Amino acid sequence: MEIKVTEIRENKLLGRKEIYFDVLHEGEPTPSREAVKGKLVAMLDLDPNTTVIQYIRSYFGSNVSKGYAKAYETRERMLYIEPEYILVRDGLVQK
Amino acid sequence: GDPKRQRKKYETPSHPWIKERLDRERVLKRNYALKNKKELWRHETQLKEFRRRARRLLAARGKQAEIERQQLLQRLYRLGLLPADAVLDDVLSLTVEDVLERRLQTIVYRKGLARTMKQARQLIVHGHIEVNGQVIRSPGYLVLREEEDTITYAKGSPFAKEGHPERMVIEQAK
Amino acid sequence: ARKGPKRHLKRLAAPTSWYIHRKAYKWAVRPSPGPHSMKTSIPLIYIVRDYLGYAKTAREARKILNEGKILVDGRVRKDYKFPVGIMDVVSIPETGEHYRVLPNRIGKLILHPISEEEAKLKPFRINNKRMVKGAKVQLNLHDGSNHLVSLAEKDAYKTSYTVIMQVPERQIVKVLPFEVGAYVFVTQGKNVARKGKIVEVRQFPMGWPDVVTIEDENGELFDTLKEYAFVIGKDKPEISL
RNA sequence: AUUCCGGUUGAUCCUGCCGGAGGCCACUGCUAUGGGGGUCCGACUAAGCCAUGCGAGUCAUGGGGCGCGCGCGCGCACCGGCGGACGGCUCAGUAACACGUCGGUAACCUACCCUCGGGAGGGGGAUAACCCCGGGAAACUGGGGCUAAUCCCCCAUAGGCCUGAGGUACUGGAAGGUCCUCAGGCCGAAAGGGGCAUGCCCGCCCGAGGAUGGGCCGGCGGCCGAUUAGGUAGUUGGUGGGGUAACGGCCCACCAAGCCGAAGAUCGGUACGGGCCAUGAGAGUGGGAGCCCGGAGAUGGACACUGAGACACGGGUCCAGGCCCUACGGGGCGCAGCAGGCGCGAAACCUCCGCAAUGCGGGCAACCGCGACGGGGGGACCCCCAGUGCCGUGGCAGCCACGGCUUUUCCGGAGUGUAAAAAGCUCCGGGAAUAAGGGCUGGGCAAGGCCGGUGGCAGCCGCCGCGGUAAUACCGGCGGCCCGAGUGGUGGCCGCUAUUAUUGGGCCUAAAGCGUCCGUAGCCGGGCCCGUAAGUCCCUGGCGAAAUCCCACGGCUCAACCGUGGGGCUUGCUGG
């Protein structure tokens, strides 16, 4: 599995970086959120916390999936802005 | 009033049991390995729509008529039915066999990737064929002019192997 | 049978002047009353969420607005139903961004980026004049706002002239008159967003409105309503278009 | 595809009707593998009837109390504010300014919102909660004590309305409409409240305008009947008044005799209207439940309170009609809101999950709630894409066998997806394994002169016609033809039909020229010159919502679907 960033935007009003990336997985299954986040931060020099992946989506026959993440500056703003269901879905938070 | 429901994109015949028509259509169905008459009828319908558009636009006045003439010719070019130096009367010389030539099953048989039309169909439906990089599983896709030379076996597919037995058998024909 | 006013808007019944996907959902935001008309304005949440993209959901947009980060004619606005309209200036200082609201040639509302020096001025068309108590003069302007002027300086103001003002403080500068060489921008009608120079004005009897004849850059002449002709300069646009 | 085929005779040409052959909608017989999209599922019959539970709340930044904790916080009911007049359901009534379009209000109202210009002074009162007693089967409800406010009341000042007399600043196409001065009078504000902190945020009242949402008026347009010909008596108008938010016989007093109509009044029948839909080469014919706009209704029929807004869809009073609890003294409820059951009938689904998205209300906000909405479940609703194997050899003329290949679908798993699931998508393992029917077979009309049976009985039959003992026409077997996850049957609209005829029919003998004439309205009308510009034609401005229609491009594997643009539609109206 490999990653390839495709568009970064900065939102100063909400205080985050919106990151659209591609994932390449030929002959392999759809990767897991853990691995995707690991490689994302290992590459772009981010804190694992303060970072949430919204979605990894695969298409009909491609081997090329798409993904969208959000990198925050501080965990307080992170938790005040993002809804709880994605935090529970990633694992940053227990119910 | 009433709202509109979705309508069929094919037209059935006026009389069901006419011998000349039955013979023609039997030949076509057999030779292009079609499953039903619906498919033949929907390609006939495509052609009839093109013809009606040309008939309406021919000898008409205004700006939109010119725009639509050029749009129609560009579309037929892009689909592979007319050349570029084509005039609007050349639309009225087209037949259903052209539209049947332009479908995936036929092109996959005509390039040599399969021994037969029914084999071509099975390849497509099972997922062994790629167009412009993308797997397509519909044997009536109507390939475009600038997609034809990119049609090959799918990357992950047994036939991608130069030594597959069925691929050896297939190539043995050529 | 309805027993009182509406509080809901169906998305298929929303104004044409909006960029809006009409079949995606059932409901749309119903605009509150305010500075412009429903046919010349759009709520803020659509700008913050759809036109610019700083938010994906209405909760995020509402948090942005309540934190106090969007200005309209230099004033903080926190209501998501507030209507923004023609010639309004939208400002975001945390980004340095400054836009003017204008119509397309189709008749839809767009954001034209501008500079910080021009984001301080806004023109107003005078729509009516009144005498108010104290022998004072009230000017009723195109966005429904009102401004007071004295007797002595009453003949300097008329009902299709334009007044340029510093917006948060509302100080007048550079009155522009309706004349025969004046530069005009069209706001409504079939010829919306065309510009040029006044050539002629015709009047009619018995309540029918007045018509104006205009010459564009290429020399093409056309016609519209005087109330649709918005003066923006004497021979050159005082603002960017 | 701007279409014909069968039927009246011993044979023929005609007229003319019946039938065949196509499409859409509803019920139904037999049969059925998968995914996706959509504005489908008690409208036709009963706007018929029921049980259980839900569908409308929110605010400690308005006020007092109590409790649970640690002067700070969490909760409970109460007073108070805003909302509850929207959303949702249905088409009974209505032939009408109800609807559509163009206009008008200089004859009107508008809480929430925007802008500008100005204000917040001085005094009082009560009462819910709480405490002590209770009454009643319940529904409900009495007395005494105590106490707050953005609760209620008074005084003043600003301000509002009426009238008369002047002046002439504004707008407009047009003014006593706004402005100024004077005079005589009637009505008559406000919460300087809350939070923070050492000026800011949220709120209160007056005025001028706008916006939003409505009320009222007019011109034009839209079904059938003469075996419905006269109708109207506040009826038509005038003067003067009342009432209304406002014009108005809307209502009153007085004066007159007008108003409508054979170009169809009145009466009756039927029906919610449109955007749209179905069909056809078109001209045209027919419909108007599901999505949007408008209108009306909440067991039938009337009448009111509160409020900016109701004569009120989850509120009130009465009569009729029905149902229920009851200790028999008295009380309570209408399922045309969601789900569920009954009945009626040919005929219509789960007493499911959630506020994560779109929006609404409240709140400074944070957030709360929502049977709206979203999500799934059931159903031969409409549309798109596919499957039920492929290759080669031998034998026949599609099948058996032999040898191989593949896995869309099937089974079993891991991730992604999702509010949570599920489905879908990526990958893995196994394995040709798991998946065709219905109607027809004499001619119209594609397909058997083959077998067994029965025997003018039994049966078939859109129409023509078969069957009476050699049945190509009945029943069945075997073969074959059409369509195909669908194919047949019954009823309705269009077309067929130039059998309603403007395009485009006929009347000597086939259905059809009044027995003949005179003439009223209407329709049709000779030649030249002058003028006008109502009809007619061209050009330009303002309108005819969105959806739905055609075309291209772009995003879902293509497609259906969705988006961005260009045209068309709204049968037309209006300024030049």
PDB file of N, CA and C in Angstrom, chain B residues 110-173:
ATOM      1  N   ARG B 110     -13.330  -8.709 -32.967  1.00  0.00           N
ATOM      2  CA  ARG B 110     -12.673  -8.252 -34.183  1.00  0.00           C
ATOM      3  C   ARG B 110     -11.199  -7.942 -33.983  1.00  0.00           C
ATOM      4  N   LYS B 111     -10.766  -7.720 -32.747  1.00  0.00           N
ATOM      5  CA  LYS B 111      -9.353  -7.511 -32.473  1.00  0.00           C
ATOM      6  C   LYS B 111      -8.585  -8.806 -32.288  1.00  0.00           C
ATOM      7  N   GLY B 112      -9.262  -9.883 -31.924  1.00  0.00           N
ATOM      8  CA  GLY B 112      -8.628 -11.167 -31.725  1.00  0.00           C
ATOM      9  C   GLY B 112      -8.445 -11.587 -30.288  1.00  0.00           C
ATOM     10  N   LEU B 113      -8.979 -10.831 -29.335  1.00  0.00           N
ATOM     11  CA  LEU B 113      -8.883 -11.194 -27.931  1.00  0.00           C
ATOM     12  C   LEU B 113      -9.784 -12.365 -27.567  1.00  0.00           C
ATOM     13  N   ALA B 114     -10.688 -12.768 -28.457  1.00  0.00           N
ATOM     14  CA  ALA B 114     -11.527 -13.935 -28.244  1.00  0.00           C
ATOM     15  C   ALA B 114     -11.694 -14.693 -29.552  1.00  0.00           C
ATOM     16  N   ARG B 115     -12.042 -15.974 -29.427  1.00  0.00           N
ATOM     17  CA  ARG B 115     -12.320 -16.797 -30.598  1.00  0.00           C
ATOM     18  C   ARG B 115     -13.714 -16.558 -31.164  1.00  0.00           C
ATOM     19  N   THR B 116     -14.674 -16.172 -30.326  1.00  0.00           N
ATOM     20  CA  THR B 116     -16.055 -16.033 -30.757  1.00  0.00           C
ATOM     21  C   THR B 116     -16.731 -14.893 -30.008  1.00  0.00           C
ATOM     22  N   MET B 117     -17.937 -14.566 -30.474  1.00  0.00           N
ATOM     23  CA  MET B 117     -18.741 -13.516 -29.861  1.00  0.00           C
ATOM     24  C   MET B 117     -19.247 -13.922 -28.485  1.00  0.00           C
ATOM     25  N   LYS B 118     -19.674 -15.171 -28.335  1.00  0.00           N
ATOM     26  CA  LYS B 118     -20.158 -15.635 -27.043  1.00  0.00           C
ATOM     27  C   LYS B 118     -19.029 -15.696 -26.023  1.00  0.00           C
ATOM     28  N   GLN B 119     -17.839 -16.092 -26.466  1.00  0.00           N
ATOM     29  CA  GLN B 119     -16.666 -16.033 -25.606  1.00  0.00           C
ATOM     30  C   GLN B 119     -16.332 -14.598 -25.222  1.00  0.00           C
ATOM     31  N   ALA B 120     -16.425 -13.675 -26.176  1.00  0.00           N
ATOM     32  CA  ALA B 120     -16.203 -12.266 -25.874  1.00  0.00           C
ATOM     33  C   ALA B 120     -17.159 -11.779 -24.794  1.00  0.00           C
ATOM     34  N   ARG B 121     -18.439 -12.110 -24.947  1.00  0.00           N
ATOM     35  CA  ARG B 121     -19.434 -11.773 -23.940  1.00  0.00           C
ATOM     36  C   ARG B 121     -19.042 -12.301 -22.568  1.00  0.00           C
ATOM     37  N   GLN B 122     -18.654 -13.573 -22.487  1.00  0.00           N
ATOM     38  CA  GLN B 122     -18.312 -14.130 -21.183  1.00  0.00           C
ATOM     39  C   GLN B 122     -17.088 -13.446 -20.587  1.00  0.00           C
ATOM     40  N   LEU B 123     -16.074 -13.169 -21.404  1.00  0.00           N
ATOM     41  CA  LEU B 123     -14.922 -12.418 -20.920  1.00  0.00           C
ATOM     42  C   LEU B 123     -15.356 -11.109 -20.281  1.00  0.00           C
ATOM     43  N   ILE B 124     -16.132 -10.318 -21.019  1.00  0.00           N
ATOM     44  CA  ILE B 124     -16.582  -9.030 -20.505  1.00  0.00           C
ATOM     45  C   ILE B 124     -17.339  -9.202 -19.193  1.00  0.00           C
ATOM     46  N   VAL B 125     -18.291 -10.132 -19.157  1.00  0.00           N
ATOM     47  CA  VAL B 125     -19.171 -10.228 -18.000  1.00  0.00           C
ATOM     48  C   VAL B 125     -18.421 -10.747 -16.784  1.00  0.00           C
ATOM     49  N   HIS B 126     -17.433 -11.613 -16.983  1.00  0.00           N
ATOM     50  CA  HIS B 126     -16.661 -12.124 -15.866  1.00  0.00           C
ATOM     51  C   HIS B 126     -15.579 -11.154 -15.415  1.00  0.00           C
ATOM     52  N   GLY B 127     -15.220 -10.181 -16.247  1.00  0.00           N
ATOM     53  CA  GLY B 127     -14.402  -9.079 -15.789  1.00  0.00           C
ATOM     54  C   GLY B 127     -12.973  -9.072 -16.281  1.00  0.00           C
ATOM     55  N   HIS B 128     -12.738  -9.624 -17.466  1.00  0.00           N
ATOM     56  CA  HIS B 128     -11.399  -9.856 -17.979  1.00  0.00           C
ATOM     57  C   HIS B 128     -10.930  -8.794 -18.968  1.00  0.00           C
ATOM     58  N   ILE B 129     -11.691  -7.723 -19.161  1.00  0.00           N
ATOM     59  CA  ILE B 129     -11.429  -6.751 -20.214  1.00  0.00           C
ATOM     60  C   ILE B 129     -11.402  -5.347 -19.628  1.00  0.00           C
ATOM     61  N   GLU B 130     -10.483  -4.521 -20.128  1.00  0.00           N
ATOM     62  CA  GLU B 130     -10.310  -3.151 -19.671  1.00  0.00           C
ATOM     63  C   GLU B 130     -10.343  -2.192 -20.850  1.00  0.00           C
ATOM     64  N   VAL B 131     -10.900  -1.009 -20.608  1.00  0.00           N
ATOM     65  CA  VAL B 131     -10.990   0.057 -21.598  1.00  0.00           C
ATOM     66  C   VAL B 131     -10.413   1.315 -20.977  1.00  0.00           C
ATOM     67  N   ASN B 132      -9.380   1.872 -21.606  1.00  0.00           N
ATOM     68  CA  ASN B 132      -8.786   3.127 -21.159  1.00  0.00           C
ATOM     69  C   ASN B 132      -8.399   3.051 -19.686  1.00  0.00           C
ATOM     70  N   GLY B 133      -8.113   1.838 -19.218  1.00  0.00           N
ATOM     71  CA  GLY B 133      -7.697   1.593 -17.858  1.00  0.00           C
ATOM     72  C   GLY B 133      -8.777   1.113 -16.913  1.00  0.00           C
ATOM     73  N   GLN B 134     -10.041   1.117 -17.328  1.00  0.00           N
ATOM     74  CA  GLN B 134     -11.168   0.866 -16.442  1.00  0.00           C
ATOM     75  C   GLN B 134     -11.933  -0.371 -16.885  1.00  0.00           C
ATOM     76  N   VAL B 135     -12.134  -1.298 -15.947  1.00  0.00           N
ATOM     77  CA  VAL B 135     -12.942  -2.482 -16.205  1.00  0.00           C
ATOM     78  C   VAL B 135     -14.379  -2.085 -16.500  1.00  0.00           C
ATOM     79  N   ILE B 136     -14.924  -2.627 -17.585  1.00  0.00           N
ATOM     80  CA  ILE B 136     -16.315  -2.431 -17.968  1.00  0.00           C
ATOM     81  C   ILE B 136     -16.929  -3.793 -18.237  1.00  0.00           C
ATOM     82  N   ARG B 137     -18.060  -4.066 -17.593  1.00  0.00           N
ATOM     83  CA  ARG B 137     -18.709  -5.367 -17.632  1.00  0.00           C
ATOM     84  C   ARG B 137     -20.008  -5.370 -18.428  1.00  0.00           C
ATOM     85  N   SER B 138     -20.230  -4.370 -19.269  1.00  0.00           N
ATOM     86  CA  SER B 138     -21.450  -4.289 -20.061  1.00  0.00           C
ATOM     87  C   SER B 138     -21.133  -4.517 -21.532  1.00  0.00           C
ATOM     88  N   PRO B 139     -21.638  -5.584 -22.155  1.00  0.00           N
ATOM     89  CA  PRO B 139     -21.276  -5.866 -23.550  1.00  0.00           C
ATOM     90  C   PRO B 139     -21.949  -4.990 -24.598  1.00  0.00           C
ATOM     91  N   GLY B 140     -22.650  -3.940 -24.185  1.00  0.00           N
ATOM     92  CA  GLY B 140     -23.211  -2.994 -25.126  1.00  0.00           C
ATOM     93  C   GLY B 140     -22.782  -1.563 -24.879  1.00  0.00           C
ATOM     94  N   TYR B 141     -21.524  -1.382 -24.479  1.00  0.00           N
ATOM     95  CA  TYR B 141     -21.036  -0.095 -24.005  1.00  0.00           C
ATOM     96  C   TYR B 141     -20.913   0.966 -25.099  1.00  0.00           C
ATOM     97  N   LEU B 142     -20.771   0.584 -26.367  1.00  0.00           N
ATOM     98  CA  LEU B 142     -20.597   1.535 -27.474  1.00  0.00           C
ATOM     99  C   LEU B 142     -19.297   2.337 -27.333  1.00  0.00           C
ATOM    100  N   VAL B 143     -18.204   1.629 -27.620  1.00  0.00           N
ATOM    101  CA  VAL B 143     -16.864   2.189 -27.535  1.00  0.00           C
ATOM    102  C   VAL B 143     -16.723   3.439 -28.385  1.00  0.00           C
ATOM    103  N   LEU B 144     -15.999   4.415 -27.852  1.00  0.00           N
ATOM    104  CA  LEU B 144     -15.691   5.647 -28.555  1.00  0.00           C
ATOM    105  C   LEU B 144     -14.440   5.502 -29.414  1.00  0.00           C
ATOM    106  N   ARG B 145     -14.312   6.419 -30.371  1.00  0.00           N
ATOM    107  CA  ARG B 145     -13.244   6.340 -31.361  1.00  0.00           C
ATOM    108  C   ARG B 145     -11.865   6.403 -30.719  1.00  0.00           C
ATOM    109  N   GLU B 146     -11.691   7.247 -29.705  1.00  0.00           N
ATOM    110  CA  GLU B 146     -10.405   7.411 -29.043  1.00  0.00           C
ATOM    111  C   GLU B 146     -10.228   6.502 -27.828  1.00  0.00           C
ATOM    112  N   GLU B 147     -11.024   5.444 -27.710  1.00  0.00           N
ATOM    113  CA  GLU B 147     -10.838   4.434 -26.684  1.00  0.00           C
ATOM    114  C   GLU B 147     -10.490   3.071 -27.251  1.00  0.00           C
ATOM    115  N   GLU B 148     -10.466   2.922 -28.573  1.00  0.00           N
ATOM    116  CA  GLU B 148     -10.456   1.593 -29.167  1.00  0.00           C
ATOM    117  C   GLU B 148      -9.090   0.937 -29.032  1.00  0.00           C
ATOM    118  N   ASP B 149      -8.036   1.670 -29.337  1.00  0.00           N
ATOM    119  CA  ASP B 149      -6.686   1.132 -29.256  1.00  0.00           C
ATOM    120  C   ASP B 149      -6.184   0.973 -27.838  1.00  0.00           C
ATOM    121  N   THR B 150      -6.998   1.206 -26.811  1.00  0.00           N
ATOM    122  CA  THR B 150      -6.606   0.978 -25.427  1.00  0.00           C
ATOM    123  C   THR B 150      -7.303  -0.228 -24.813  1.00  0.00           C
ATOM    124  N   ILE B 151      -7.953  -1.054 -25.621  1.00  0.00           N
ATOM    125  CA  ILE B 151      -8.727  -2.184 -25.127  1.00  0.00           C
ATOM    126  C   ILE B 151      -7.810  -3.394 -25.034  1.00  0.00           C
ATOM    127  N   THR B 152      -7.709  -3.965 -23.839  1.00  0.00           N
ATOM    128  CA  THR B 152      -6.778  -5.045 -23.572  1.00  0.00           C
ATOM    129  C   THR B 152      -7.346  -5.896 -22.446  1.00  0.00           C
ATOM    130  N   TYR B 153      -6.622  -6.954 -22.099  1.00  0.00           N
ATOM    131  CA  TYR B 153      -6.965  -7.730 -20.922  1.00  0.00           C
ATOM    132  C   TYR B 153      -6.719  -6.909 -19.663  1.00  0.00           C
ATOM    133  N   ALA B 154      -7.547  -7.151 -18.657  1.00  0.00           N
ATOM    134  CA  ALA B 154      -7.386  -6.485 -17.376  1.00  0.00           C
ATOM    135  C   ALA B 154      -6.066  -6.882 -16.724  1.00  0.00           C
ATOM    136  N   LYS B 155      -5.487  -5.941 -15.977  1.00  0.00           N
ATOM    137  CA  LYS B 155      -4.178  -6.161 -15.370  1.00  0.00           C
ATOM    138  C   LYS B 155      -4.176  -7.418 -14.511  1.00  0.00           C
ATOM    139  N   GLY B 156      -5.066  -7.480 -13.529  1.00  0.00           N
ATOM    140  CA  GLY B 156      -5.220  -8.689 -12.752  1.00  0.00           C
ATOM    141  C   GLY B 156      -6.230  -9.608 -13.398  1.00  0.00           C
ATOM    142  N   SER B 157      -5.740 -10.527 -14.208  1.00  0.00           N
ATOM    143  CA  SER B 157      -6.583 -11.418 -14.986  1.00  0.00           C
ATOM    144  C   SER B 157      -5.715 -12.538 -15.539  1.00  0.00           C
ATOM    145  N   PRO B 158      -6.155 -13.790 -15.448  1.00  0.00           N
ATOM    146  CA  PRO B 158      -5.323 -14.895 -15.948  1.00  0.00           C
ATOM    147  C   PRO B 158      -4.827 -14.702 -17.368  1.00  0.00           C
ATOM    148  N   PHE B 159      -5.670 -14.167 -18.248  1.00  0.00           N
ATOM    149  CA  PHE B 159      -5.301 -14.037 -19.648  1.00  0.00           C
ATOM    150  C   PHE B 159      -4.171 -13.042 -19.850  1.00  0.00           C
ATOM    151  N   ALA B 160      -3.882 -12.217 -18.847  1.00  0.00           N
ATOM    152  CA  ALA B 160      -2.710 -11.357 -18.908  1.00  0.00           C
ATOM    153  C   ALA B 160      -1.417 -12.149 -19.013  1.00  0.00           C
ATOM    154  N   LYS B 161      -1.449 -13.442 -18.704  1.00  0.00           N
ATOM    155  CA  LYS B 161      -0.259 -14.277 -18.729  1.00  0.00           C
ATOM    156  C   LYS B 161      -0.047 -14.832 -20.130  1.00  0.00           C
ATOM    157  N   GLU B 162       1.130 -14.558 -20.695  1.00  0.00           N
ATOM    158  CA  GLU B 162       1.449 -14.988 -22.051  1.00  0.00           C
ATOM    159  C   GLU B 162       1.282 -16.490 -22.256  1.00  0.00           C
ATOM    160  N   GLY B 163       1.227 -17.279 -21.185  1.00  0.00           N
ATOM    161  CA  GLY B 163       1.153 -18.721 -21.298  1.00  0.00           C
ATOM    162  C   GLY B 163      -0.123 -19.380 -20.830  1.00  0.00           C
ATOM    163  N   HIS B 164      -1.206 -18.637 -20.648  1.00  0.00           N
ATOM    164  CA  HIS B 164      -2.457 -19.258 -20.246  1.00  0.00           C
ATOM    165  C   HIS B 164      -2.947 -20.187 -21.356  1.00  0.00           C
ATOM    166  N   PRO B 165      -3.515 -21.347 -21.016  1.00  0.00           N
ATOM    167  CA  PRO B 165      -3.898 -22.292 -22.079  1.00  0.00           C
ATOM    168  C   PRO B 165      -4.992 -21.766 -22.995  1.00  0.00           C
ATOM    169  N   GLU B 166      -6.056 -21.194 -22.429  1.00  0.00           N
ATOM    170  CA  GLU B 166      -7.125 -20.656 -23.259  1.00  0.00           C
ATOM    171  C   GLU B 166      -6.641 -19.490 -24.103  1.00  0.00           C
ATOM    172  N   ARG B 167      -5.706 -18.693 -23.588  1.00  0.00           N
ATOM    173  CA  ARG B 167      -5.156 -17.615 -24.399  1.00  0.00           C
ATOM    174  C   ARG B 167      -4.304 -18.162 -25.535  1.00  0.00           C
ATOM    175  N   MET B 168      -3.572 -19.247 -25.284  1.00  0.00           N
ATOM    176  CA  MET B 168      -2.853 -19.909 -26.365  1.00  0.00           C
ATOM    177  C   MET B 168      -3.819 -20.369 -27.448  1.00  0.00           C
ATOM    178  N   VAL B 169      -4.911 -21.015 -27.039  1.00  0.00           N
ATOM    179  CA  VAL B 169      -5.920 -21.466 -27.998  1.00  0.00           C
ATOM    180  C   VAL B 169      -6.477 -20.285 -28.782  1.00  0.00           C
ATOM    181  N   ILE B 170      -6.761 -19.182 -28.093  1.00  0.00           N
ATOM    182  CA  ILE B 170      -7.316 -18.003 -28.749  1.00  0.00           C
ATOM    183  C   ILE B 170      -6.344 -17.467 -29.790  1.00  0.00           C
ATOM    184  N   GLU B 171      -5.091 -17.252 -29.393  1.00  0.00           N
ATOM    185  CA  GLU B 171      -4.099 -16.713 -30.315  1.00  0.00           C
ATOM    186  C   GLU B 171      -3.841 -17.654 -31.483  1.00  0.00           C
ATOM    187  N   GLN B 172      -4.014 -18.961 -31.275  1.00  0.00           N
ATOM    188  CA  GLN B 172      -3.761 -19.917 -32.346  1.00  0.00           C
ATOM    189  C   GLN B 172      -4.600 -19.618 -33.583  1.00  0.00           C
ATOM    190  N   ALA B 173      -5.767 -19.000 -33.406  1.00  0.00           N
ATOM    191  CA  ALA B 173      -6.607 -18.659 -34.549  1.00  0.00           C
ATOM    192  C   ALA B 173      -5.922 -17.637 -35.449  1.00  0.00           C
TER     193      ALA B 173
END
